[PDB]
Amino acid sequence: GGMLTLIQGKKIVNHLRSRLAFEYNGQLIKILSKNIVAVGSLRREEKMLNDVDLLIIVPEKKLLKHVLPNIRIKGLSFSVKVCGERKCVLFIEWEKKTYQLDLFTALAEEKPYAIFHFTGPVSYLIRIRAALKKKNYKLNQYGLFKNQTLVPLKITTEKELIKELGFTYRIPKKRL
Amino acid sequence: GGMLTLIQGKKIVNHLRSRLAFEYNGQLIKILSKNIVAVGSLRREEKMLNDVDLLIIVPEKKLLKHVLPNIRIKGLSFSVKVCGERKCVLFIEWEKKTYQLDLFTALAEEKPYAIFHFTGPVSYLIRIRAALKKKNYKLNQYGLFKNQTLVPLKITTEKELIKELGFTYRIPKKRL
DNA sequence: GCGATCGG
DNA sequence: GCGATCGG
């Protein structure tokens, strides 16, 4: 995959927002724009991107075996590098060039945790996870755990999650 | 990668044996046939293969950062799917079809352990490892360990390793 | 730091 | 059963 500017990346995401779908036992099911979240380097507003990173929110557990493994993009040429239920990496043709499209899935109840994980950057996640690990917590893209048991937090958004975890809220661009 | 017959796989390995090399700070270093071992489904003599599996024996630790990351195959078209110091997955062109070639590296002192691991099958490895784990040992492709410490066994071959571990020696085809 | 999807 | 490369 070629490198992209932030603007090229945003243009691609805009194009993709109305064109993603998946095949479910023969039936083409459209993925809704509101369930597509730009994450990664794109959400961090970095100047150059190495890929385009999208998080797809899926409404039901049963659908995970179907969404990424049967992903469809209307009108766009692509090939699959690797693909499972949770991560799918595609190479897409856009104008004269091939770019890497990284797709991830989260269930609705995982959404704040997923956004936080897939936003990164990695250095920042390592620091946050290390501090929580010292207090016997484990944080990942699915939830907050203690002694291998889900800690049910009363949150809906990434911001609420960050504050409930006891860290300073910073906009994605400023996380390091 | 397409599926291959055992015969096709063996023909490919024969071709590759004299044609593998790596670039080391600008110089092309041939890999010797005696340091190339057919492993996996090929060594188990399975009728159909999903890929061709080769283990490359590397004489010095310092060379690991160079071998797979700078692999060269004379006269054969290939592309890299993933590649590190210990695992490299290639797609090769062979008689107008594309196949998957899986390359792994072992240091000389790891060789019997690596052969045993990369031969499998997986079901057999799980059983063997579980039994050793009950006695506080850990077996992997690098050695036999107890309390995170290498158990120095006085062996050279896979057969000697198997017997020293206290299991019945069976030819690769009959391991289950 | 932690998980996905391999790798045998 | 145990480890590698790559995902943020």
Side-chain angles (χ1 to χ4, degrees), chain A residues 1-95 98-162 164-176, chain B residues 1-92 94-95 98-153 155-158 160-162 164-176:
Chain A
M3 288 189 49
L4 288 154
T5 66
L6 183 57
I7 188 150
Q8 287 155 5
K10 289 179 169 169
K11 291 341 294 165
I12 290 163
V13 172
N14 190 54
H15 185 85
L16 291 173
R17 279 193 170 284
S18 59
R19 288 177 178 80
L20 294 180
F22 67 103
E23 200 158 283
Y24 173 51
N25 307 135
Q27 298 149 316
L28 192 67
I29 300 174
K30 290 191 269 194
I31 292 166
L32 311 178
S33 185
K34 78 196 291 275
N35 291 321
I36 297 163
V37 184
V39 293
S41 54
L42 177 63
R43 186 163 186 256
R44 295 194 304 274
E45 292 185 296
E46 289 174 16
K47 297 193 188 201
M48 291 295 295
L49 310 172
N50 291 300
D51 36 67
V52 185
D53 312 332
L54 298 179
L55 178 66
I56 299 167
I57 310 302
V58 181
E60 184 156 25
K61 293 179 179 179
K62 79 179 188 173
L63 293 179
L64 282 173
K65 59 181 95 67
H66 302 279
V67 176
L68 295 186
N70 305 299
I71 198 74
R72 299 289 181 270
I73 309 175
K74 189 234 282 287
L76 210 78
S77 299
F78 68 93
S79 64
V80 183
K81 174 152 95 91
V82 293
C83 189
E85 298 183 12
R86 293 287 194 167
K87 176 188 89 172
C88 179
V89 179
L90 308 177
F91 297 120
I92 63 166
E93 302 293 323
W94 181 261
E95 291 163 12
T98 299
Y99 302 111
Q100 183 171 318
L101 182 45
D102 298 341
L103 308 171
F104 312 97
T105 52
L107 299 174
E109 63 270 27
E110 305 167 355
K111 180 173 176 173
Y113 303 94
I115 288 168
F116 188 55
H117 167 95
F118 287 112
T119 297
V122 176
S123 66
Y124 176 72
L125 297 183
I126 290 167
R127 185 167 65 76
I128 292 297
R129 288 166 182 208
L132 289 166
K133 186 174 188 174
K134 273 186 291 194
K135 304 181 211 196
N136 205 41
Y137 289 97
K138 185 188 64 162
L139 179 67
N140 61 31
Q141 63 263 56
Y142 303 129
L144 179 71
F145 300 92
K146 176 151 66 179
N147 299 315
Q148 293 80 38
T149 299
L150 183 68
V151 178
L153 298 176
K154 274 269 205 298
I155 53 91
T156 312
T157 72
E158 190 206 41
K159 181 154 67 178
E160 289 169 350
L161 171 56
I162 288 162
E164 184 61 41
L165 294 170
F167 296 98
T168 310
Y169 181 77
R170 293 179 183 102
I171 65 169
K173 186 176 64 181
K174 297 177 193 273
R175 294 176 199 175
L176 289 135
Chain B
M3 289 200 62
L4 287 154
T5 67
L6 182 58
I7 298 314
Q8 287 155 5
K10 288 180 169 168
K11 288 174 65 168
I12 289 164
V13 172
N14 188 249
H15 186 86
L16 291 172
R17 279 193 170 285
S18 59
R19 288 178 177 79
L20 294 179
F22 66 101
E23 199 165 310
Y24 175 48
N25 306 138
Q27 211 148 72
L28 192 66
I29 299 173
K30 290 204 231 205
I31 292 165
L32 313 178
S33 184
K34 78 196 291 275
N35 290 326
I36 296 164
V37 186
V39 294
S41 54
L42 193 43
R43 186 164 187 255
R44 294 194 303 274
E45 292 186 295
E46 289 174 17
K47 295 193 188 202
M48 290 296 294
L49 306 177
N50 288 299
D51 36 67
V52 170
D53 311 333
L54 299 177
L55 177 67
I56 297 168
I57 310 302
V58 177
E60 305 190 60
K61 272 138 59 61
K62 294 178 189 172
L63 294 178
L64 281 174
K65 59 181 95 67
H66 302 279
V67 178
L68 294 186
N70 305 297
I71 198 74
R72 300 289 182 266
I73 310 175
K74 183 178 179 180
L76 208 77
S77 301
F78 69 93
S79 65
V80 184
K81 183 178 179 180
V82 293
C83 188
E85 298 183 12
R86 293 286 194 167
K87 176 189 89 172
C88 180
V89 180
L90 310 176
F91 297 120
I92 64 165
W94 182 262
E95 292 164 11
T98 304
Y99 302 111
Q100 185 171 315
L101 176 48
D102 297 342
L103 309 172
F104 311 96
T105 52
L107 300 174
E109 63 269 27
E110 305 166 355
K111 180 172 176 173
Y113 303 96
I115 289 167
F116 189 54
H117 166 95
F118 287 112
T119 298
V122 177
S123 67
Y124 176 72
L125 297 183
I126 290 168
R127 185 168 65 77
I128 292 298
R129 286 166 183 207
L132 289 167
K133 185 175 189 173
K134 273 187 291 194
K135 304 180 210 196
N136 199 35
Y137 289 99
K138 185 187 63 162
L139 180 67
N140 62 31
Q141 64 262 57
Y142 305 130
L144 180 70
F145 298 88
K146 177 150 67 179
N147 299 316
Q148 294 80 39
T149 297
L150 182 67
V151 177
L153 298 176
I155 58 171
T156 312
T157 71
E158 191 206 40
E160 288 169 349
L161 171 56
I162 288 162
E164 184 61 41
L165 295 169
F167 297 99
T168 310
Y169 180 78
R170 293 179 182 103
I171 65 169
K173 186 175 65 181
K174 296 177 193 273
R175 294 177 199 176
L176 191 64

Short mmCIF file of all heavy atoms in Angstrom, two decimals, chain A residues 44 53 87 102, chain D residues 5-8:
data_model
loop_
_atom_site.label_atom_id
_atom_site.label_comp_id
_atom_site.label_asym_id
_atom_site.label_seq_id
_atom_site.Cartn_x
_atom_site.Cartn_y
_atom_site.Cartn_z
N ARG A 44 -6.24 10.40 14.60
CA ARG A 44 -5.16 11.16 15.24
C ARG A 44 -4.75 12.39 14.42
O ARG A 44 -3.92 13.16 14.85
CB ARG A 44 -3.93 10.28 15.53
CG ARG A 44 -4.19 9.18 16.55
CD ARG A 44 -2.91 8.54 17.06
NE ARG A 44 -2.07 8.01 16.00
CZ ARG A 44 -2.18 6.79 15.47
NH1 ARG A 44 -3.10 5.93 15.89
NH2 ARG A 44 -1.35 6.44 14.51
N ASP A 53 -7.93 3.43 8.29
CA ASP A 53 -8.38 2.57 9.38
C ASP A 53 -9.82 2.85 9.76
O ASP A 53 -10.16 3.96 10.16
CB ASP A 53 -7.49 2.75 10.62
CG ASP A 53 -6.01 2.69 10.29
OD1 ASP A 53 -5.61 2.03 9.31
OD2 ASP A 53 -5.22 3.32 11.00
N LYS A 87 -10.47 -8.67 12.27
CA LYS A 87 -9.55 -7.86 11.47
C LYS A 87 -9.57 -8.31 10.03
O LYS A 87 -9.51 -9.50 9.72
CB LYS A 87 -8.11 -7.92 12.01
CG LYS A 87 -7.10 -7.18 11.15
CD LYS A 87 -5.65 -7.40 11.56
CE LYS A 87 -5.10 -8.60 10.83
NZ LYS A 87 -3.64 -8.75 11.05
N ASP A 102 -7.56 -0.98 6.41
CA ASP A 102 -7.63 -1.84 7.60
C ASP A 102 -9.01 -1.72 8.23
O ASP A 102 -9.43 -0.64 8.65
CB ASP A 102 -6.56 -1.44 8.63
CG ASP A 102 -5.13 -1.59 8.11
OD1 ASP A 102 -4.92 -2.32 7.12
OD2 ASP A 102 -4.21 -0.97 8.70
P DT D 5 8.76 -13.45 13.40
OP1 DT D 5 9.65 -13.67 12.26
OP2 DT D 5 9.31 -12.76 14.59
"O5'" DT D 5 7.48 -12.67 12.89
"C5'" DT D 5 6.75 -13.14 11.76
"C4'" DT D 5 5.54 -12.27 11.53
"O4'" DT D 5 4.56 -12.47 12.57
"C3'" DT D 5 5.83 -10.76 11.48
"O3'" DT D 5 5.19 -10.34 10.28
"C2'" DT D 5 5.19 -10.22 12.75
"C1'" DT D 5 4.06 -11.21 12.99
N1 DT D 5 3.60 -11.35 14.37
C2 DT D 5 2.26 -11.53 14.58
O2 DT D 5 1.44 -11.55 13.67
N3 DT D 5 1.90 -11.70 15.89
C4 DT D 5 2.74 -11.72 16.99
O4 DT D 5 2.28 -11.91 18.10
C5 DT D 5 4.14 -11.52 16.70
C7 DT D 5 5.13 -11.54 17.82
C6 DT D 5 4.50 -11.35 15.42
P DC D 6 5.21 -8.82 9.80
OP1 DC D 6 5.26 -8.84 8.32
OP2 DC D 6 6.21 -8.07 10.58
"O5'" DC D 6 3.78 -8.30 10.26
"C5'" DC D 6 2.57 -8.95 9.83
"C4'" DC D 6 1.40 -8.47 10.66
"O4'" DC D 6 1.55 -8.89 12.04
"C3'" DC D 6 1.23 -6.95 10.70
"O3'" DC D 6 -0.16 -6.64 10.82
"C2'" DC D 6 1.79 -6.59 12.07
"C1'" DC D 6 1.23 -7.75 12.84
N1 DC D 6 1.71 -7.98 14.21
C2 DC D 6 0.79 -8.42 15.15
O2 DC D 6 -0.38 -8.62 14.81
N3 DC D 6 1.19 -8.61 16.43
C4 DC D 6 2.45 -8.36 16.78
N4 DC D 6 2.81 -8.56 18.05
C5 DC D 6 3.41 -7.89 15.83
C6 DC D 6 3.01 -7.73 14.57
P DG D 7 -1.07 -6.31 9.53
OP1 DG D 7 -1.71 -7.56 9.07
OP2 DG D 7 -0.30 -5.42 8.61
"O5'" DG D 7 -2.24 -5.43 10.14
"C5'" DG D 7 -1.90 -4.32 10.97
"C4'" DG D 7 -2.95 -4.15 12.04
"O4'" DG D 7 -2.79 -5.18 13.04
"C3'" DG D 7 -2.86 -2.84 12.80
"O3'" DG D 7 -3.67 -1.92 12.09
"C2'" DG D 7 -3.42 -3.19 14.16
"C1'" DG D 7 -3.03 -4.65 14.33
N9 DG D 7 -1.83 -4.89 15.13
C8 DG D 7 -0.53 -4.95 14.67
N7 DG D 7 0.33 -5.21 15.61
C5 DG D 7 -0.44 -5.33 16.76
C6 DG D 7 -0.06 -5.63 18.09
O6 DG D 7 1.07 -5.84 18.53
N1 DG D 7 -1.16 -5.66 18.94
C2 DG D 7 -2.46 -5.47 18.56
N2 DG D 7 -3.38 -5.54 19.52
N3 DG D 7 -2.83 -5.21 17.31
C4 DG D 7 -1.78 -5.15 16.48
P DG D 8 -3.19 -0.43 11.86
OP1 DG D 8 -4.05 0.17 10.82
OP2 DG D 8 -1.72 -0.40 11.74
"O5'" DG D 8 -3.48 0.24 13.27
"C5'" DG D 8 -4.81 0.48 13.71
"C4'" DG D 8 -4.78 1.08 15.10
"O4'" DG D 8 -4.77 0.04 16.10
"C3'" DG D 8 -3.56 1.93 15.43
"O3'" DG D 8 -3.63 3.24 14.85
"C2'" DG D 8 -3.61 1.95 16.94
"C1'" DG D 8 -4.24 0.59 17.29
N9 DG D 8 -3.30 -0.35 17.88
C8 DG D 8 -3.36 -0.83 19.17
N7 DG D 8 -2.35 -1.58 19.49
C5 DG D 8 -1.56 -1.61 18.34
C6 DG D 8 -0.33 -2.27 18.09
O6 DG D 8 0.32 -2.99 18.85
N1 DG D 8 0.12 -2.03 16.80
C2 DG D 8 -0.51 -1.25 15.87
N2 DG D 8 0.09 -1.15 14.68
N3 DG D 8 -1.66 -0.62 16.09
C4 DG D 8 -2.12 -0.84 17.35
#
